[PDB]
Design a binder for this molecule. Sequence first.
Ligand SMILES: C[N+](C)(C)CCOP(=O)(O)O
Ligand SMILES: [Ca+2]
Ligand SMILES: [Ca+2]
Ligand SMILES: [Zn+2]
Ligand SMILES: [Zn+2]
Length: 540
Amino acid sequence: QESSGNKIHFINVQEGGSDAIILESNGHFAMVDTGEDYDFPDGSDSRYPWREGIETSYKHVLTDRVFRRLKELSVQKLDFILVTHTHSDHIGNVDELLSTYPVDRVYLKKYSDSRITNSERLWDNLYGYDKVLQTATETGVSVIQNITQGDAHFQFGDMDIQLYNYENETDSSGELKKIWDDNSNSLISVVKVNGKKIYLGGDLDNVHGAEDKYGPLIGKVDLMKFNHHHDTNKSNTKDFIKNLSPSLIVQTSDSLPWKNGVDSEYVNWLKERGIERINAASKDYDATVFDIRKDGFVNISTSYKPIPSFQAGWHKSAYGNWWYQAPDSTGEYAVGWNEIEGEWYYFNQTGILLQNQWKKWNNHWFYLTDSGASAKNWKKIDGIWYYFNKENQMEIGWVQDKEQWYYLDVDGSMKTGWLQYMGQWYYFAPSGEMKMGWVKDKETWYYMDSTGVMKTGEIEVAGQHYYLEDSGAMKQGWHKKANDWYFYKTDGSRAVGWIKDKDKWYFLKENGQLLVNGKTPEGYTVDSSGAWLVDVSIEK
Ligand SMILES: C[N+](C)(C)CCOP(=O)(O)O
Ligand SMILES: [Ca+2]
Ligand SMILES: [Ca+2]
Ligand SMILES: [Zn+2]
Ligand SMILES: [Zn+2]
């Protein structure tokens, strides 16, 4: 007849892989996935702990591109948002979209962290999933989580849409069947219009037999979105592509088909088949766009406005805060940790630079200085010395720096004075360094060995002898070792020959032992205490 047109916009990545797809049909708009969003959980909420691999790079955020395309299309409302799975690069902008546009319904299969067998593949799935459910209820939007056969087949404008892999698969106890990764759970969408079929399968893989199962059921299509961006290890199996036999494959990725490197053999196998393969990646246009005509798909991408220019660098908001647009971005702003000209800066999820504050991140403490730059090496904060390692983490415990040892307390604060560490005693200077050798604390001397350990008992250093008491304190004056008396001088050193103590003269032998009841080398007499009997005449 005469509708206003049928189009599909695959939002272009800057790099990496992410799915956001706009369906346009006779003035109706809907989305299949929504791309990566700026937002992410920082670990401050125990429900959504920080996990290695959660996306924080502006290079992977599709938010600007999604909302620019919708605005450029004069979208007033979305008939539906379909979410294929809970990965941030698919579900990311759903809540932002629900906050921005009226939405009639969201398709969202059940998820829980428990149904994923691998701890290492949880990331921020639940955070993204909860955002959809929470924001949908807050904006009045029905979430279809229990898709019936009836639900699975519906009209959208001129488009006929059929879903596959839509059921929640459960065990005897009604809890979700376990899978290796949420990719296996991908909600499949097949779109029919103007005699053309388009397959849209999110990150579908064959680990739990999904490609084996749905290949034969889906059958011949024209345009196939590649499953899972670029992967050929577990997705896009030969049987699946033979079953669908597309003339055109669109990858939502800047990468070639990939399996530990370019999968050149798979690339060639696709060519031998006459399949056209296109990457939805661009620095210049928000989307790879096809006009879906009876006589074929027309690439109309460049018929839209190019991405606007931007001024790179640091920018100051109206409220005095800082945000940043990297010169290698296409306008997307920095969030989370970002290395900028040799310093590390942390930006919150809305893109604001944090300054002059402690920040806990992935179980370590960081201090963001005046400029925002994370502290490195010694830093004095609120009157206390702290030490930050080469990775900006506040150190605790023993730290070696510039050929000296330091100890940082449990709260990061530098230790000075006495420390009992692992059953032994150490002493740190007021400037923090662990002291070796002779150290004066208050009005007592102590002797620490080469490793800083306070010594006890008799010692010899540089030809002189000292006695350290059990507490470590250097002895001064009289000391009995076994059956002999010794005298330690003011400097601690063991005396030899004649010494004067308390107006009496005492003779210490070669070996430091006190002569008692006998004659000195010159023939003087000493009493039982070793004191010289002054009245007794010299006698040789
Ligand atoms: C969630 N994630 C983006 C960190 C992992 C990658 O997800 P996927 O697109 O490879 O399935
Ligand atoms: Ca995100
Ligand atoms: Ca979001
Ligand atoms: Zn993905
Ligand atoms: Zn995925």
